[PDB]
Amino acid sequence: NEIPKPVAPAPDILRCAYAELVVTDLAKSRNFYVDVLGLHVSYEDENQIYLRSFEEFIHHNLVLTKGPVAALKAMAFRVRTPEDVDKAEAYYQELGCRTERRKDGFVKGIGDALRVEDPLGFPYEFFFETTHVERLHMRYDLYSAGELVRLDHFNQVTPDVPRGRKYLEDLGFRVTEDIQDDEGTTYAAWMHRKGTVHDTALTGGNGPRLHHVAFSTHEKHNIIQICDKMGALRISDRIERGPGRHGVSNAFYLFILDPDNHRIEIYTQDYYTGDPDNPTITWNVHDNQRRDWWGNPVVPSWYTEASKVLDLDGNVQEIIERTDDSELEVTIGADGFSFTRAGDEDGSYHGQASKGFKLG
Amino acid sequence: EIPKPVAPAPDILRCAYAELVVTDLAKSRNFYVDVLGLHVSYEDENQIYLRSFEEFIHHNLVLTKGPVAALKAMAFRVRTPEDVDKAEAYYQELGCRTERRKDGFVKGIGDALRVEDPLGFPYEFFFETTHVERLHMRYDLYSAGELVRLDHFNQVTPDVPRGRKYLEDLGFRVTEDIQDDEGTTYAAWMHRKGTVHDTALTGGNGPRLHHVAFSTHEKHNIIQICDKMGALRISDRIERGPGRHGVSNAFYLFILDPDNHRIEIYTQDYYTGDPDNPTITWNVHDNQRRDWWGNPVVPSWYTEASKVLDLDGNVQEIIERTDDSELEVTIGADGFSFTRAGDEDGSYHGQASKGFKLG
Amino acid sequence: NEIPKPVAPAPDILRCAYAELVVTDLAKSRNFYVDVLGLHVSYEDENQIYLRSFEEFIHHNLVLTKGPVAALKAMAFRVRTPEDVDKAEAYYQELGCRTERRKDGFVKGIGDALRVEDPLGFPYEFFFETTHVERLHMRYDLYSAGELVRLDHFNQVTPDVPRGRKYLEDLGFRVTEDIQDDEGTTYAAWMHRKGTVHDTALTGGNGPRLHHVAFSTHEKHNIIQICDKMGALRISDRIERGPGRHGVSNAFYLFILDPDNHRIEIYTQDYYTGDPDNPTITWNVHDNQRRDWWGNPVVPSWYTEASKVLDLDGNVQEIIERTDDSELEVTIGADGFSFTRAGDEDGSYHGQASKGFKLG
Amino acid sequence: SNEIPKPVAPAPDILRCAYAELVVTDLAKSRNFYVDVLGLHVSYEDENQIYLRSFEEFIHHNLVLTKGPVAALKAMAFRVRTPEDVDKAEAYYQELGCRTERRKDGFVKGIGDALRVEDPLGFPYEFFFETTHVERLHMRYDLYSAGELVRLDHFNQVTPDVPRGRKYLEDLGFRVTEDIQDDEGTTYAAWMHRKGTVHDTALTGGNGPRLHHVAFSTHEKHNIIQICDKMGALRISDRIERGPGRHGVSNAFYLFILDPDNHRIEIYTQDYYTGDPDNPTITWNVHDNQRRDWWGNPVVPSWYTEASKVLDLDGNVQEIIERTDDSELEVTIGADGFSFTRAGDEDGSYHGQASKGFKLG
Ligand SMILES: [Ca+2]
Ligand SMILES: [Cl-]
Ligand SMILES: [Cl-]
Ligand SMILES: [Cl-]
Ligand SMILES: [Cl-]
Ligand SMILES: [Fe+2]
Ligand SMILES: [Fe+2]
Ligand SMILES: [Fe+2]
Ligand SMILES: [Fe+2]
């Protein structure tokens, strides 16, 4: 059932800015994000760790908060002006959503902020005010071989992609790429504000769940180094999928799992989307180059596993099951199909994955 | 067991070229020249002679049109002309069939000896070769995926220790191997030129040629080969990778030519030229040994390999391996692998890593 | 004298989009831009060559036009909507500037367009409508080892940097970085619309002249390959300066010269500037890490040579001499000075360039 | 004749360059350069010495820093194939009439039976086989730096008569891969190898004996860029002497930097294979402006004039003999010099100055 376009104007969203993840063991989480991945500590105490990427000047891109159940607490977007926080509040109130306004913020280093339970059940934050910190972009004395340089995007699991897509377009996101079939089903959509391929994305599945948070590197070798280091630390079992080249987005990528199974993507070298008529690319769901351009198989956990999200009271949001077709099932499941070249039987896969594999 | 001859081994410098029989020369040319960017030293209607960016000898790869795709010769360069005579005396003492051609078997090679070696492989030894323009600074020709050197061969043979002892007597030094706790050897790597290997033995039914490997300068050059194959919509010919190897520590990719000959692209292994270079043995169940990142080894990697020819041009009969199968003990229904030895977390039983089983 | 701020609203400028350069020998220029640099031909005839970068979807990023005197004919910015071309016309008419509007464009592949002789003497174009072409961003079968992936910026030589800066700020560009001294002189300023360090920049000098046009690559090795290729072609004398790391912008860079001496920069890996409170950075003109972070000397031609620009009648604009202090003279001239560490005599240079050189 | 005659005694079989011992004046400041800035790995340290190795090394060290009163090269060490090659080295240099010192338990920690010699060009060479093996760090990506130095690649020596030194090194088994000459018959520089890269040592024409540099490898070109970027961030870009660049000779990507005592260190990657015995030898003309930097960037004058003192076996600085052959600096970038981009083309040539608009400071 369609989400109506408010009469109230949408807040002017700049970009994704930070995520707040609830973690069960703060020290174990710190080891992963600081010792393994090299993120920079803006502040920490016994309850939280505030982390930022190499080129960031706002206070943080990730807040790790100790709690009893691992989950997304907030995905936060920065808006253009202080007045845009009021616009966000009016907009979501018109949508009939639950909102909470804190003039001095929900986390350290953020000022006036609005959190909402959005129409898809996700906890979004909108803020302008943030404490500036030392921008480390030329601190090559600190630069890691695997350095994470920016926060790039979020990716959300939701059962009805077109419903969510309309809502995000009304909010001002522009769809850059999607995955559909020839029977009218949408499996995934990518959408932006900042002029990269995306600031968030929708992946079809049971939800609301958080699929991943993505950080950028400068170069491909930086992503390779993360893999290599994970090998050396004998934690290659925490490499979920990749490294690879995406079809959708054209970015070089890697998916890894934190200690609470929150999925983190490392990402580089997508393209510019800032023109308002940026061409929107649709891939067919059976195209075996759409997710991994090299045709490597998508690991099944990528389609089945994702993080819980919290409501504004701190309780886990109920999951609504997807009724639309499953991307897993139609591509790599027993009745699935994929191709390398459209219309060619040679290099096609029937009821299994590419490269000689089946689902475990 | 293969006895050590009284005759001295020829002094082998390095792997130098492979001669592959291909069924459609134009389709093979597309792959090796248009897709992969190797440089043409000579061609006609019957053969294409190719070399890498930094090579000064005539060629690293000869593609010969023939009825059955197969390895025709894997050639090693020896230090002096007199080493070809040593090779002949050596293989005659071993009781092997040999053929000597004072003017070579292929263009751009002079005095050469071909043998059917004790493992059934067609080896060539030569010194004399026609020098060509070394293209190492020809950056006007340099491809984003440029192949810069020939690095090694990899051979499938059923009894790895038997082959390893023979290659050690021939002067190759083992650098790395894969074994299990119960004393089975699955693979060994061995060198002359001071890299991890010039050839390698992979346990399996043989003789078959597993692959020929070329080097790039950097990891991004290997990524570009993958990217290009996607753009050409031939990603189905990317067999396995890209990855980081455990054994050798090299960044790698395996692709398949039009006759299913497997080619590896490889970079950034380490120096092995000291005579006490430490050997490294990996456990077969270690899921970081072949792909350091734990990505699963695709089953075709263990099962598929190229036929090899005898000196009459006929396919060599295959002898079955009786020792344990690396595929079966790691990714088969009764196999297992680990991330950390002794840890059930991050271990895989009856299937491959990353959530896959065999198709 | 100060350029007034119009009452009329500024057009919403998206980004730098293309340059039109006049060249004297179209075949020799084609060899440089297509055969040496690998740019992609959108259209060509006996009078013009239209070129685009690897990731571009608009018709072109560079038009080479045969003519009698090598010069910049137009520096074009894309605007957000067709209505913004009307806004640009009103804005420049209010400024008292010569304008010319053509509903079907000045070059192939551009529609309704406004060209102006701006207050600094530069031929600016504003357009929205453009012919979309095949985006080559995943055409790795065409990808060069030195592939140019995007148009990044222009750089303009103008005698009075503060005067120009105020004008560009009123027009909506946001200053990201600048170079000044302790006596109130501004030597250069960088300013953006699209969320990178810049879309254009002002370099103090006799003007109007065009200093350079810059294209991006994905990675640093792509820039090194251009150098290597130019060595193999035995045209290393056309490598003007670099490769290096910039202080200002933090980008990896190279400056080369086309057959008519137009300067082309290759550039990669600057940072995100899209937030409205993006911190500005001011460098001192005597800081020897400001232009080349590694302290390599700035070649003197970089300060003295730049391209002629045309007015709307196709005639070369008269050059007005800078009276403010010269960056060349105050840093590497006979009475100049530069430092490695502020206040440290060790690693400072008096009356000469860094690394043991004087001016030839 | 000045020739160094070939001994009748067989040459030791030399594997490769292995380590250098450098005397430094302030051990803590040197440690901060080699460990904290460059990321070399500690094999042993005390208040007098620091022993360091590269990422892929299995022998005990590639560099020994020894506190002393005068910064200088104390020894440039080559590993030999077998224990018996140390005896061969001793007999070889004794036949040449050189001062030798044999220590059956080594001169530095982690090296066993070793011979040091004052060689015929005045350099302190060491030959050894026995060395303490350590953990090879080649897969320790948890320790890998963005600028990681992976191997010791070569030494480079300044000596006044390049042909005289070249013949001596060839007799010792080094093979020349590249050199720089002019049409008048002067040799300015030569590169020579044992291990199958472009070189293990090299001769640069100039006043000597002096040590021009010690060179370490990286995996990739971005690793070298990172060293530069890090030195900028540390505000020690004045210690970047020359580069980064692409060499003509060797085809390697390179950078030259200066340690706290002004010992020059090169970072180097991606030269080519030279192991075949008929490896084609490449001669460049001294006036070719692409021979040293392929992109035609000018060679910094200090690169031609400055180099490190070397010690004799008593720890005293070796007397320096002046070059009488033509100077590479003078004939290329000096007042009466010249260079070209294209041979025979005045366009892209430089006369009485360097390339890119620069004169000598
Ligand atoms: Ca269908
Ligand atoms: Cl994906
Ligand atoms: Cl493997
Ligand atoms: Cl600059
Ligand atoms: Cl040099
Ligand atoms: Fe993503
Ligand atoms: Fe291999
Ligand atoms: Fe620029
Ligand atoms: Fe060197």
Compute the half-sphere exposure of residue B101: CA atoms within 13 Å on the CB side of its CA. Answer: 12
From first CA to last CA, the distance across chain C in angstroms is 37
Cis peptide before B207 (omega within 30 of 0): yes
The answer on D163 and D46 residing in a single domain is no
Which residues, including other chains, have CB under 8 Å from residue C45's CB and lie 6 or more apart?
Answer: none
The answer on B133 and B19 residing in a single domain is yes
Residue C35 DSSP symbol: I
Ligand 6 mean position, distance from CA D144 (Å):
27
Q: Does C135 touch chain B (CB under 8 A)?
A: no
Give burial (CB, 10 Å; 0-12/13-18/19+) of C311: middle
Query: How many angstroms separate the CA atoms of B72 and B79, rounded?
Result: 23
The answer on B39 and B117 residing in a single domain is yes
DSSP strands (E only) in A129-197: 150-158, 174-180, 186-192
Q: What residue in A sits closest to C217 (Cα-Cα)?
A: A269
Q: Check CB contact under 8 Å for A132 and C279.
A: yes
Interface test with C, best of A18, A245, A272, A280 (most C CBs within 10 A): A272
Query: How many angstroms separate the CA atoms of A150 and A32, rounded?
Result: 17
How close, in Å, is residue B145 to chain C by CA atoms?
8
Query: How many angstroms separate the CA atoms of A226 and D55, rounded?
Result: 17
Ligand 5 mean position, distance from CA D247 (Å):
6
Ligand 5 mean position, distance from CA D260 (Å):
22
A220 is written with which tokens? 């491909």
Q: Check CB contact under 8 Å for D236 and C340.
A: yes
Using CA of residue B339, residue B342, residue B346, residue B348, what is the dihedral sign? positive
Whole-angstrom CA distances from B112 to B43, B75, B150 are: 21, 9, 20
* Residues present in chain B in total: 359
Question: What residues pair up with C245 in beta bridges, in sequence order?
Answer: C252
Ligand 8 mean position, distance from CA C235 (Å):
22
Query: How many angstroms separate the CA atoms of D142 and D55, rounded?
Result: 12
Residues of D in contact with A232 (CB under 8 A): 139-143
- The residue type of A54 is F
Characterize D314-341 residue by residue with b for buried, 16 or more Cβ atoms within 10 angstroms of its Cβ, and e for exposed.
eeeebebeebeebbbbebbbbeebbbbb
Q: Give domain status of residue B4, yes or no.
A: no
B181: annotated binding-site residue? yes
For residue C131, which of C153, C98, C109, C102 has the smallest C-alpha distance? C109
Q: What residue in C sits closest to D342 (Cα-Cα)?
A: C234
B154 is written with which tokens? 């990899």
Which residues, including other chains, have CB under 8 Å from residue B330's CB and lie 6 or more apart?
Answer: B284, B285, B287, B297, B336, B337
For residue D17, which of D258, D205, D245, D268 has the smallest C-alpha distance? D268
CB atoms within 10 A of CB A185: 17
- SS3 (DSSP) at B235: helix
C183 is written with which tokens? 């006596």
Which parts of chain D fold into alpha helices (H)? 27-31, 84-95, 162-171, 221-233, 301-305, 328-332
Query: How many angstroms separate the CA atoms of D190 and D167, rounded?
Result: 11
Residues of C in contact with B139 (CB under 8 A): 145, 225, 228-229, 231-232
Between A and B, how many CB-CB pairs are < 8 A?
120
Task: Please give, one letter per residue, the 3-state secondary structure of A15-40.
Answer: EEEEEEEEECCHHHHHHHHHHHCCCE
Ligand 3 mean position, distance from CA B267 (Å):
13
* Nearest CB partner across the interface for A340, out of B236, B293, B358: B236
For residue B75, which of B93, B90, B57 has the smallest C-alpha distance? B57
Whole-angstrom CA distances from B311 to B73, B96, B114, B249, B293 are: 9, 11, 8, 36, 41
CB atoms within 10 A of CB D81: 17
- SS3 (DSSP) at C234: coil
How close, in Å, is residue B66 to chain A by CA atoms?
24
For residue B106, which of B37, B18, B39 has the smallest C-alpha distance? B18
Contacts 24+ apart (CB under 8 A), C186-192: C186/C161, C186/C162, C186/C324, C187/C161, C187/C285, C187/C324, C187/C325, C187/C327, C188/C161, C188/C248, C188/C327, C189/C161, C189/C164, C189/C165, C190/C248, C190/C249, C191/C165, C192/C273
Whole-angstrom CA distances from A131 to A354, B265, B336, C177 are: 48, 49, 51, 21
Query: How many angstroms separate the CA atoms of B187 and A7, rounded?
Result: 70
CB atoms within 10 A of CB B139: 24
Q: Does B233 touch chain A (CB under 8 A)?
A: yes
Question: What residues pair up with C110 in beta bridges, in sequence order?
Answer: C130
Question: What residues pair up with C244 in beta bridges, in sequence order?
Answer: C253
Q: Between β-strands B262-267 and B208-215, what pairing exists: parallel, antiparallel or unpaired?
A: parallel
Q: Does B138 touch chain C (CB under 8 A)?
A: yes
Last residue of a domain, which of C288, C308, C340? C288
Residues of C in contact with A77 (CB under 8 A): none
What is the DSSP code string of B148-177? -EEEEEEEEES-HHHHHHHHHHTT-EEEEE
- The residue type of D102 is R
Question: What residues pair up with B21 in beta bridges, in sequence order?
Answer: B64, B70
Whole-angstrom CA distances from A37 to A30, A34, A145, A264, C37 are: 10, 5, 10, 10, 37
Q: Give domain status of residue B2, yes or no.
A: no
Q: Give domain status of residue D191, yes or no.
A: yes
The answer on D268 and D140 residing in a single domain is no
Whole-angstrom CA distances from D227 to A258, D24, D39, D149, D267 are: 31, 22, 10, 10, 9
Q: Between β-strands D358-360 and A123-127, what pairing exists: parallel, antiparallel or unpaired?
A: unpaired
* Torsion angle defined by CA atoms of residues B308, B312, B317 and B318, in that order, rounded to the nearest 10 degrees: -20
Contact C11, C112 (CB under 8 A): no
From the CA of B241, the nearest ligand is 3
Query: How many angstroms separate the CA atoms of A311 and A69, rounded?
Result: 13
From first CA to last CA, the distance across chain A in angstroms is 36
DSSP strands (E only) in chain C: 13-23, 40-44, 48-52, 62-66, 71-79, 99-102, 113-117, 123-127, 150-158, 174-180, 186-192, 200-204, 209-216, 239-245, 252-257, 263-268, 281-284, 337-338, 349-350, 357-359
- The residue type of B273 is G
Contact A188, A178 (CB under 8 A): yes
Contact D348, D340 (CB under 8 A): yes
Counting DSSP H helices and E strands in chain B, the numbers are 6, 20
Residue A312 DSSP symbol: T
Query: How many angstroms separate the CA atoms of D2 and C349, rounded?
Result: 44
Query: How many angstroms separate the CA atoms of C345 and C352, rounded?
Result: 14
Task: Please give, one letter per residue, the 3-state secondary structure of D101-135.
Answer: EEECCCCCCCECCEEEEECCCCCEEEEECCECCCC
Last residue of a domain, which of A149, A168, A195? A149
Query: How many angstroms separate the CA atoms of D54 and D151, rounded?
Result: 5
Q: Does B236 touch chain A (CB under 8 A)?
A: yes
From first CA to last CA, the distance across chain D in angstroms is 39
Q: Does C355 touch chain D (CB under 8 A)?
A: yes
Q: Give domain status of residue C88, yes or no.
A: yes
Q: Does A293 touch chain B (CB under 8 A)?
A: yes
The answer on C305 and C213 residing in a single domain is no
**How many whole angstroms from its chain centre is CA B244?**
17
D5 is written with which tokens? 């005659």
Ligand 6 mean position, distance from CA A154 (Å):
7
Can you say which residues of D are annotated as belonging to the binding site for Fe(3+)? 154, 213, 266
Query: How many angstroms separate the CA atoms of C95 and C210, rounded?
Result: 22
Query: How many angstroms separate the CA atoms of D227 and D231, rounded?
Result: 6
CB atoms within 10 A of CB A1: 5
For residue B337, which of B325, B350, B324 has the smallest C-alpha distance? B350
- The residue type of A305 is E
- SS3 (DSSP) at B32: helix
Contact C138, B226 (CB under 8 A): no
Query: How many angstroms separate the CA atoms of C290 and C298, rounded?
Result: 10
Contact A167, A124 (CB under 8 A): no
Q: What are phi and psi of C193, to 5 degrees?
A: -115, -45
Q: Give domain status of residue C28, yes or no.
A: yes
Q: Between β-strands D49-53 and D41-45, what pairing exists: parallel, antiparallel or unpaired?
A: antiparallel
Between A and C, how many CB-CB pairs are < 8 A?
62
* Nearest CB partner across the interface for A276, out of C80, C269, C272: C80
Contact A218, A268 (CB under 8 A): yes
Residues of A in contact with B337 (CB under 8 A): none
Whole-angstrom CA distances from D345 to A350, C237, D159, D247 are: 65, 12, 33, 22
Q: What residue in C sits closest to B135 (Cα-Cα)?
A: C232
Which parts of chain A fold into alpha helices (H)? 26-30, 83-94, 161-170, 220-232, 300-304, 327-331
The answer on D199 and D146 residing in a single domain is no
Contact B17, B32 (CB under 8 A): no
Residue B298 DSSP symbol: P
Q: What residue in A sits closest to D139 (Cα-Cα)?
A: A232
The answer on B168 and B136 residing in a single domain is no
What is the DSSP code string of D308-337? B-BB-TTSPBPPPB---SPPHHHHHTSTT-
Query: How many angstroms separate the CA atoms of C241 and A168, rounded?
Result: 46
| Radius of gyration of chain D from its Cα atoms, rounded to whole angstroms | 20
Q: Give domain status of residue D206, yes or no.
A: yes
Last residue of a domain, which of B148, B173, B206? B148
Query: How many angstroms separate the CA atoms of D149 and A145, rounded?
Result: 13
Which residues, including other chains, have CB under 8 Å from residue D188's CB and lie 6 or more apart?
Answer: D162, D179, D180, D181, D182, D204, D205, D286, D325, D326, D328
Characterize D90-113 residue by residue with b for buried, 16 or more Cβ atoms within 10 angstroms of its Cβ, and e for exposed.
bbbbeebeeebeeeeebbbebbbb
The answer on C229 and C124 residing in a single domain is no
Please give the tally of structural domains in chain D: 3
Contact C134, C205 (CB under 8 A): no
Query: How many angstroms separate the CA atoms of B204 and B154, rounded?
Result: 12
Whole-angstrom CA distances from D101 to D66, D79, D98, D124, D312 are: 19, 16, 10, 11, 11
- SS3 (DSSP) at A272: coil
Query: How many angstroms separate the CA atoms of A244 and B226, rounded?
Result: 9
Q: Check CB contact under 8 Å for D146 and A147.
A: yes
Query: How many angstroms separate the CA atoms of D257 and D266, rounded?
Result: 6
Query: How many angstroms separate the CA atoms of B288 and D244, rounded?
Result: 36
Q: Give domain status of residue A5, yes or no.
A: no
- SS3 (DSSP) at C233: coil
Query: How many angstroms separate the CA atoms of B228 and B36, rounded?
Result: 9
Phi-psi region of A68 (alpha: psi -120 to 50; beta: other; left: phi over 0): alpha
A12 is written with which tokens? 């002017």
* Residues present in chain C in total: 360
Q: Between β-strands C186-192 and C200-204, what pairing exists: parallel, antiparallel or unpaired?
A: antiparallel
Which parts of chain B fold into alpha helices (H)? 25-29, 82-94, 160-169, 219-231, 299-303, 326-330
Query: How many angstroms separate the CA atoms of D44 and D46, rounded?
Result: 7
Query: How many angstroms separate the CA atoms of B172 and B158, rounded?
Result: 19
Give burial (CB, 10 Å; 0-12/13-18/19+) of D67: middle
Query: How many angstroms separate the CA atoms of D327 and D333, rounded?
Result: 10
Ligand 2 mean position, distance from CA A291 (Å):
4
Cis peptide before A208 (omega within 30 of 0): yes
Contact D216, D149 (CB under 8 A): yes
CB atoms within 10 A of CB A9: 11
Q: Give domain status of residue B357, yes or no.
A: yes
Ligand 7 mean position, distance from CA B226 (Å):
17
Query: How many angstroms separate the CA atoms of D265 and D213, rounded?
Result: 5
Query: How many angstroms separate the CA atoms of A252 and A270, rounded?
Result: 8
Which parts of B170-284 fold into alpha helices (H)? 219-231
Contact C190, C293 (CB under 8 A): no
* Nearest CB partner across the interface for D142, out of A138, A141, A229: A229
Whole-angstrom CA distances from C326 to B103, C159, D170 are: 71, 10, 55
What is the DSSP code string of A79-108? ESSTHHHHHHHHHHHHTT--EEEETT-SST
Contact C254, C36 (CB under 8 A): no
Which residues, including other chains, have CB under 8 Å from residue D251's CB and lie 6 or more apart?
Answer: B136, B137, D198, D270, D271, D272, D294
Chains linked to C by 3 or more Cβ pairs within 8 Å: A, B, D
The answer on B245 and B157 residing in a single domain is yes
For residue D166, which of D194, D117, D204 has the smallest C-alpha distance? D204
The answer on A230 and A103 residing in a single domain is no
Q: Between β-strands D350-351 and A252-257, what pairing exists: parallel, antiparallel or unpaired?
A: unpaired
Query: How many angstroms separate the CA atoms of D355 and D237, rounded?
Result: 22
The answer on A325 and A237 residing in a single domain is no
Instruction: Report the CATH number at residue A123.
Output: 3.10.180.10
Give burial (CB, 10 Å; 0-12/13-18/19+) of C80: middle
Residues of C in contact with B138 (CB under 8 A): 232
Instruction: Report the CATH number at residue D328.
Output: 4.10.1270.10
A127 is written with which tokens? 């803020």
- The residue type of B260 is N
Domain membership of residue C77 as a residue range: 11-149
From the CA of D191, the nearest ligand is 9
C224 membership: H or E segment, kind and range: helix C220-232
Contact C76, C21 (CB under 8 A): no
What is the DSSP code string of C82-143? HHHHHHHHHHHHHTT--EEEETT-SSTTB-SEEEEE-TTS-EEEEE--B------TT-TTT-
The answer on C298 and C273 residing in a single domain is no
Using CA of residue D106, residue D111, residue D114, residue D116, what is the dihedral sign? negative
Query: How many angstroms separate the CA atoms of C291 and C156, rounded?
Result: 16
